[PDB]
């Protein structure tokens, strides 16, 4: 069980690192993808909707 | 009855520790109590 505890913590350390990287990627992708187009494709087309 | 008891001695000794067995048996008994404590500790910690 103690060896199993070390293995699970090793998975738990790996799981923690993977979840931290995945959540960092999640926040970055959320911000970039969700807000860029809703602001760029909005404004760039709204600027086109303005100027053109 | 004492002669017959020496007879019991001569009867079962041929055919076939104790204080140390008793003391170390008790010692291992609380050692295994501490052990089931470590088991509930390790099992519950592994479960969480």
Curated annotation (Swiss-Prot), chain A:
How would you summarize where this protein is expressed among tissues?
Answer: Expressed at high levels in the testis, fetal liver, thymus, bone marrow and at lower levels in the lymph nodes, placenta, colon and spleen. Present in all cell lines examined, including B-cells, T-cells, epithelial cells and fibroblast cells. Expressed at high levels in glioblastoma cell lines.
- Tell me the compartments it is located in: Cytoplasm; Nucleus; Chromosome, Centromere, Kinetochore
**Coiled-coil intervals, chain numbering:** 1-42
Q: What family is reported?
A: Belongs to the CENP-U/AME1 family.
**What does the subunit section of this Swiss-Prot or TrEMBL entry state?**
Component of the CENPA-NAC complex, at least composed of CENPA, CENPC, CENPH, CENPM, CENPN, CENPT and CENPU. The CENPA-NAC complex interacts with the CENPA-CAD complex, composed of CENPI, CENPK, CENPL, CENPO, CENPP, CENPQ, CENPR and CENPS. Interacts with MLF1. Interacts with PLK1.
Please explain the role this protein plays, according to its UniProt record. Answer: Component of the CENPA-NAC (nucleosome-associated) complex, a complex that plays a central role in assembly of kinetochore proteins, mitotic progression and chromosome segregation. The CENPA-NAC complex recruits the CENPA-CAD (nucleosome distal) complex and may be involved in incorporation of newly synthesized CENPA into centromeres. Plays an important role in the correct PLK1 localization to the mitotic kinetochores. A scaffold protein responsible for the initial recruitment and maintenance of the kinetochore PLK1 population until its degradation. Involved in transcriptional repression.
Report the protein name in the record: Centromere protein U
Q: Which residues of the full protein are shown?
A: 315 to 366 of 418
UniProtKB/Swiss-Prot annotation, chain B:
Full protein name:
Centromere protein Q
Covered range of the whole protein: 109 to 161 of 268
Could you read off the lineage of the organism from its UniProt record?
Eukaryota, Metazoa, Chordata, Craniata, Vertebrata
Q: Where in the cell is it found?
A: Nucleus; Chromosome, Centromere
Describe the family membership recorded for this protein in Swiss-Prot or TrEMBL. Belongs to the CENP-Q/OKP1 family.
Domain of life, source organism: Eukaryota
How this chain assembles, per its entry, is:
Component of the CENPA-CAD complex, composed of CENPI, CENPK, CENPL, CENPO, CENPP, CENPQ, CENPR and CENPS. The CENPA-CAD complex interacts with the CENPA-NAC complex, at least composed of CENPA, CENPC, CENPH, CENPM, CENPN, CENPT and CENPU.
Entry function = Component of the CENPA-CAD (nucleosome distal) complex, a complex recruited to centromeres which is involved in assembly of kinetochore proteins, mitotic progression and chromosome segregation. May be involved in incorporation of newly synthesized CENPA into centromeres via its interaction with the CENPA-NAC complex. Plays an important role in chromosome congression and in the recruitment of CENP-O complex (which comprises CENPO, CENPP, CENPQ and CENPU), CENPE and PLK1 to the kinetochores.
Q: Which gene encodes it?
A: CENPQ
């Amino acid at each position: 069980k103690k060896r199993q505890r070390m293995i699970e913590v090793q998975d738990e350390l790996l799981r923690l690192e993977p979840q931290l990287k995945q959540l960092q990627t999640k926040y970055d992708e959320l911000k970039e993808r969700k807000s860029s187009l809703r602001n760029a494709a909005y404004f760039l087309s709204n600027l086109k909707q303005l100027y053109q | 009855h004492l002669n017959f008891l020496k007879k019991r001695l001569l009867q079962q000794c041929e055919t076939l520790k104790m204080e140390d067995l008793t003391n170390v048996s008790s010692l291992l008994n609380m050692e295994r109590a501490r052990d089931k404590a470590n088991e509930e500790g390790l099992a519950l910690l592994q479960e969480e």
